Amino acid sequence: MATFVELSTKAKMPIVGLGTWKSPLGKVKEAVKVAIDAGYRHIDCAYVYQNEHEVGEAIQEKIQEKAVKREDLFIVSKLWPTFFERPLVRKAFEKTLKDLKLSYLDVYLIHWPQGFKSGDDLFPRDDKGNAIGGKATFLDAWEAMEELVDEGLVKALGVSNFSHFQIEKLLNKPGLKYKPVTNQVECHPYLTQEKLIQYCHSKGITVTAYSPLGSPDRPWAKPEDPSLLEDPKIKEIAAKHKKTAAQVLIRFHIQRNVIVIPKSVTPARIVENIQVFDFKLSDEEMATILSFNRNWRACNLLQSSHLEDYPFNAEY
């Protein structure tokens, strides 16, 4: 059973969650079932993954069979940037909630800070593959999302892939009702996010680390890309504890009080990824791992660098 990170709202977010990004239909339902059986309570979802309906089915099964109560689950989803225009925030949220078969979400995140062309083409692009921008901004979206919290449909709001510049732009908006409770970003020993975590924490904002294993499966993997699971120095630390490299990579975030969401649909791995509360990385081991920073992003996907609120140019 995972420990928790307390949010600014006093809600308790389980520090390990199950990721569902790229989890196929016909596997994601069983993945969520196995996860809940293994003690996972936090499940990370998104509209853009187009699998929320099967996640919802799995959650419903486990609740009606008394494996878990809704109050003890922590379900997070995300608003895609083709839906930043006011009425579409509502409609997109409604489809997410309907697919998940839930009555509320625990956290609802802005998935990406730059708005795209409004509509149900999720990846509007030109001939070169560059994203087509839209005029509604993440602040427009936030305004619409705040109603969901007013109505009890969402317990807390947060952001994802935001730089500290964009969080500042959000935090400094006059007339804000609700503040972000987390910033979900890529984080692992090759991209340690030291300044962003320090910034976020200084503002009472948690960090959720995605791609903690370096996302070995990503199709865009260049053969020369670095490989965390095969890194001899990560492997050394795992051997010392008779744990796997994956378990070290996950425990690394836990000891920084950072929430972490490893994705898997393989039952053995799902179980493995939450067996991280029976060992401790020492101070030297933590320091060694931090020294691996290469400022390397696996997940730079959006050729949206030409659009206004691009997160990945700033230092942090």
Residue 305 annotated as lining a ligand binding site: no
Beta carbon nearer to ligand NAP, 127 or 187:
187
Query: Is residue 49 among the annotated active site residues?
Result: yes
266 scored as a contact of ligand NAP (CB under 6 A): yes
Question: Which residues 6+ apart lie within 8 Å of 139 measured at CB?
Answer: 169, 170, 173
Among residues 63, 42, 146, 47, the alpha carbon closest in space to that of 98 is found at 47
Cβ(290)–Cβ(278) below 8 Å: no
261 scored as a contact of ligand NAP (CB under 6 A): yes
Q: How far apart are CA 153 and CA 117, in angstroms?
A: 26
Q: How far apart are CA 289 and CA 308, in angstroms?
A: 34
Beta carbon nearer to ligand NAP, 49 or 199:
49
Q: How far apart are CA 114 and CA 100, in angstroms?
A: 25
Neighbour tally for 280: CB within 10 Å:
13
269 scored as a contact of ligand NAP (CB under 6 A): yes
Beta carbon nearer to ligand NAP, 44 or 231:
44
Look-up of token digits 């009555």: 103
Residues in region 93-122 near ligand NAP by CB under 6 A: 111
Cβ(118)–Cβ(81) below 8 Å: no
Among residues 47, 18, 5, 37, the alpha carbon closest in space to that of 156 is found at 5
Residue 21 annotated as lining a ligand binding site: yes
Q: Identify the residue among 82, 166, 183, 211 touching ligand NAP (CB under 6 A).
A: 211
77 scored as a contact of ligand NAP (CB under 6 A): no
Contact segment (CB under 6 A) with ligand NAP among 80-88, 97-105, 269-277, 278-286 equals: 269-277
Q: Which residues pair with 13 in a beta bridge?
A: 5
Residue 110 annotated as lining a ligand binding site: no
Residues in region 19-38 near ligand NAP by CB under 6 A: 19-21
Cβ(212)–Cβ(196) below 8 Å: no
DSSP tag of 223: T
Cβ of residue 117: shortest distance to ligand NAP, in angstroms?
19
Cβ of residue 181: shortest distance to ligand NAP, in angstroms?
14
192 scored as a contact of ligand NAP (CB under 6 A): no
Q: Identify the residue among 34, 213, 237, 259 touching ligand NAP (CB under 6 A).
A: 213
Question: Which residues 6+ apart lie within 8 Å of 272 measured at CB?
Answer: 244, 246, 247
Q: Which of 40, 47, 49, 190 is catalytic?
A: 49
Q: Which residues pair with 259 in a beta bridge?
A: 208
- Known binding-site positions for substrate: 111
- Known binding-site positions: 20-22, 44, 111, 160-161, 184, 210-217, 261-273
Binding site for ligand NAP (CB under 6 A): 19-21, 44, 111, 160-161, 184, 210-217, 229, 246, 261-266, 269, 272-273
